[PDB]
Amino acid sequence: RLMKVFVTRRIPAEGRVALARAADCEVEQWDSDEPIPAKELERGVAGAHGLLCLLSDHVDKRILDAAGANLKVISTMSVGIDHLALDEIKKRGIRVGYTPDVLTDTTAELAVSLLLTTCRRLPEAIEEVKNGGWTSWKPLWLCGYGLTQSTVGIIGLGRIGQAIARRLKPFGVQRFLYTGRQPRPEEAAEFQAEFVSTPELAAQSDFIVVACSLTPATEGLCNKDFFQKMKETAVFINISRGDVVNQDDLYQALASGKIAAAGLDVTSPEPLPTNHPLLTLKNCVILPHIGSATHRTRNTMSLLAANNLLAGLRGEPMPSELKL
Amino acid sequence: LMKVFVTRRIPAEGRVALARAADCEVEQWDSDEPIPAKELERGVAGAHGLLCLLSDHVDKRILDAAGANLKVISTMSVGIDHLALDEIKKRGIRVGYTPDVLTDTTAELAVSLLLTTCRRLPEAIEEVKNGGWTSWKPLWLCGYGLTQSTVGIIGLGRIGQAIARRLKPFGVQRFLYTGRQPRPEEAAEFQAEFVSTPELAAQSDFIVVACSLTPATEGLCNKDFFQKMKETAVFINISRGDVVNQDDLYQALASGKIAAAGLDVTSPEPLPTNHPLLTLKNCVILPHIGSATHRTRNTMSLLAANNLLAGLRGEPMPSELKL
Numbered sequence: 151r152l153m154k155v156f157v158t159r160r161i162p163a164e165g166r167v168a169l170a171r172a173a174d175c176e177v178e179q180w181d182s183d184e185p186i187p188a189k190e191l192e193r194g195v196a197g198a199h200g201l202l203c204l205l206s207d208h209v210d211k212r213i214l215d216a217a218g219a220n221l222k223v224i225s226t227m228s229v230g231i232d233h234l235a236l237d238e239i240k241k242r243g244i245r246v247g248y249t250p251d252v253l254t255d256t257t258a259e260l261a262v263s264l265l266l267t268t269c270r271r272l273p274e275a276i277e278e279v280k281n282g283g284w285t286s287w288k289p290l291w292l293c294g295y296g297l298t299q300s301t302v303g304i305i306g307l308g309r310i311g312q313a314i315a316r317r318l319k320p321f322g323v324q325r326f327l328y329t330g331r332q333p334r335p336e337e338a339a340e341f342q343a344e345f346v347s348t349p350e351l352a353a354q355s356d357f358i359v360v361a362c363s364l365t366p367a368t369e370g371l372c373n374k375d376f377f378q379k380m381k382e383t384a385v386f387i388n389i390s391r392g393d394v395v396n397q398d399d400l401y402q403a404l405a406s407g408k409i410a411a412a413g414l415d416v417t418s419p420e421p422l423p424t425n426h427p428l429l430t431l432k433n434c435v436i437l438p439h440i441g442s443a444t445h446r447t448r449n450t451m452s453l454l455a456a457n458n459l460l461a462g463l464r465g466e467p468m469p470s471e472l473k474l
Numbered sequence: 475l476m477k478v479f480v481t482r483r484i485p486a487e488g489r490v491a492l493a494r495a496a497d498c499e500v501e502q503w504d505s506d507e508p509i510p511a512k513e514l515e516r517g518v519a520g521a522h523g524l525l526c527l528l529s530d531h532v533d534k535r536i537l538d539a540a541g542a543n544l545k546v547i548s549t550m551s552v553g554i555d556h557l558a559l560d561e562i563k564k565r566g567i568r569v570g571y572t573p574d575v576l577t578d579t580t581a582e583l584a585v586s587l588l589l590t591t592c593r594r595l596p597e598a599i600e601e602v603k604n605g606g607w608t609s610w611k612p613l614w615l616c617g618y619g620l621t622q623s624t625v626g627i628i629g630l631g632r633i634g635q636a637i638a639r640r641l642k643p644f645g646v647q648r649f650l651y652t653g654r655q656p657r658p659e660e661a662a663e664f665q666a667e668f669v670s671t672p673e674l675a676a677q678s679d680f681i682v683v684a685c686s687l688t689p690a691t692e693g694l695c696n697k698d699f700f701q702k703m704k705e706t707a708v709f710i711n712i713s714r715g716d717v718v719n720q721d722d723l724y725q726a727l728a729s730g731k732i733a734a735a736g737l738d739v740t741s742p743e744p745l746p747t748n749h750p751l752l753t754l755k756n757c758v759i760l761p762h763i764g765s766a767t768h769r770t771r772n773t774m775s776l777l778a779a780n781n782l783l784a785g786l787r788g789e790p791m792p793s794e795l796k797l
């Protein structure tokens with residue numbers, strides 16, 4: 151009576167071993183580092199009891215139907231959940247596992263890394279070395295934007311947004327602002343952060359860091375209108391989802407001098423075509439969605455995803471279940 | 475009128491200070507490019523005051539060029555290893571430099587570099603532009619975290635302290651440091667342990683060098699340093715080029731003896747574009763941009779000018795170097 155499990159990719163070893171040991175399961179896997187096409191996904195999920203997927207696998211009505219009534223648990227190796235058809239998943243009584251907390255510190259780290267390479271202009275500095283542009287120490291050359299006495303606006307002061315604030319505080323940040331559905335005064339206290347409106351966040355911040363979820367509410371949030379309320383000297387950082395940022399409005403505002411610079415960990419689509427105008431701008435840094443990328447973290451998420459699925463398979467509590 | 479030579483275009487505020495001085499005759503190297511030693515010797519002849527950069531070589535020949543008039547040298551920098559201090563002392567010439575005003579900015583850059591290096595941002599940046607990016611991937615571009623790490627700081631001075639303070643909320647579990655002498659009061663903020671240099675290499679997951687360049691720091695970071703470091707560790711230098719044995723570093727990185735290196739300084743500066751370290755994907759090199767924010771740089775310009783003026787008029791200087 152072996153439950154079928156499908157894994158949509160080669161995952162870190164700790165998660166792969168935990169599945170392999172599950173003697174009540176047979177594990178079928180997409181043996182590749184490359185994304186599984188949708189029709190190969192539809193083929194592999196057929197009659198699966200459990201699905202172990204990733205943030206870039208689109209788990210829509212099409213693949214839930216391809217799977218049929220066997221499917222009881224979908225374990226995603228990510229904290230983001232927007233790639234999942236939650237309404238349809240709910241309707242069918244299927245359990246969801248995801249990976250919060252476990253990747254928080256690492257992602258916060260990556261966000262501050264990105265904010266700092268962008269704000270201190272490291273990539274064009276690097277290139278001035280390689281291309282022969284460097285001729286000496288120069289007093290007014292490659293001057294960037296410093297965090298001392300600065301105001302930091304965070305859109306979405308969740309666990310990752312809190313961990314980012316905590317990492318920027320010792321940099322001499324004067325004032326923390328934040329935006330969202332409701333205040334979090336218990337959370338914000340640590341930073342003496344102020345709850346403000348989006349327009350006030352834009353007008354007042356030297357640094358804007360977006361660390362919210364993708365919802366209907368957050369889709370297209372940072373558009374022309376937003377970059378226009380921003381300071382000309384401000385730096386814009388997005389580590390959330392690509393669809394939060396209008397990329398045409400971003401390019402324009404970067405190209406026209408409406409903001410100083412931006413660093414993106416996330417894009418629309420992913421990958422961004424090497425062709426994209428964003429990639430031609432020297433005041434734009436784009437990273438390939440590496441927020442949670444250290445082995446230890448990815449090992450930890452992989453094991454968490456495994457254990458979510460196995461418990462979900464056995465009718466047990468999950469280490470980290472997403473409810474309803 | 476006291477004669478002044480300025481070896482470069484300095485940021486406005488400081489240049490303004492010098493243009494508003496009625497007691498002074500100011501000559502500038504009117505350029506963003508460094509002064510030939512030959513032009514510097516001509517430039518400084520007769521000068522009472524020299525306002526100079528960390529990259530000008532103020533040796534015997536330039537002091538002798540300048541002559542007995544020379545009363546103040548004011549450098550737009552904190553480092554002083556480009557001044558022949560022994561000769562300056564004995565000639566009784568006063569020195570100005572720029573401590574403190576650049577401490578926060580430089581620490582900021584050093585953590586910038588450590589993070590760009592250890593989270594592999596360059597490699598990442600180019601996987602994007604060169605079409606290597608194909609999806610999100612669980613085992614790809616994984617770097618080295620600060621959580622539960624050991625950071626060794628070589629030189630827990632002003633900047634080394636501002637560095638550790640910025641590193642602490644990243645979850646560092648342990649700070650070690652070394653130097654000539656412990657600094658117990660300053661060490662305490664980080665609970666840092668003073669250890670030898672071999673022990674600091676052996677234990678540290680991340681190594682930051684924020685020391686001054688002296689005869690005893692010179693070539694400190696060499697083959698045997700790199701040999702005792704963890705094969706997983708990351709090496710950052712923001713001090714001076716000459717603290718590092720560059721060949722040993724190249725050798726170490728190319729053979730996997732350490733994980734990677736971020737450098738804000740090299741030997742010589744600029745590093746030639748075909749140099750061996752520029753062929754390694756695990757080596758990040760920045761063009762000595764530690765103090766590069768406009769606001770820090772103007773404050774430096776203004777300091778360097780006021781230190782000069784004050785010396786020229788026999789007054790106490792905002793920041794004099796004690797010789």
Ligand SMILES: NC(=O)C1=CN([C@@H]2O[C@H](COP(=O)(O)OP(=O)(O)OC[C@H]3O[C@@H](n4cnc5c(N)ncnc54)[C@H](OP(=O)(O)O)[C@@H]3O)[C@@H](O)[C@H]2O)C=CC1
Pocket residue numbers: 229230231250251253257305306307308309310311329330331332361362363364365367368389390391415416439440441442
């Ligand atoms: N770059 C990377 O590799 C990674 C990226 N991420 C992304 O970042 C997100 C971080 O989530 P995490 O902190 O773990 O969990 P959280 O749910 O706590 O973070 C989401 C935040 O978004 C806020 N938010 C929701 N709607 C809005 C809105 N309309 N305007 C402003 N803020 C809003 C929420 O606050 P409120 O409800 O009060 O509005 C909350 O603070 C993930 O959902 C994921 O998409 C996560 C991990 C790694």
Ligand SMILES: NC(=O)C1=CN([C@@H]2O[C@H](COP(=O)(O)OP(=O)(O)OC[C@H]3O[C@@H](n4cnc5c(N)ncnc54)[C@H](OP(=O)(O)O)[C@@H]3O)[C@@H](O)[C@H]2O)C=CC1
Pocket residue numbers: 552553554573574576577580628629630631632633634652653654655656684685686687688690691712713714738739762763764765
């Ligand atoms: N990349 C850049 O733009 C910048 C580079 N610099 C460089 O950084 C240096 C530090 O400046 P700052 O902190 O303001 O000056 P400090 O005078 O405070 O010097 C810092 C440290 O050098 C240390 N030192 C001397 N010898 C050794 C050694 N044997 N081993 C370990 N440490 C040693 C001192 O420690 P101890 O006496 O106990 O040995 C002190 O901790 C400057 O001298 C300059 O060369 C500075 C600013 C910007």
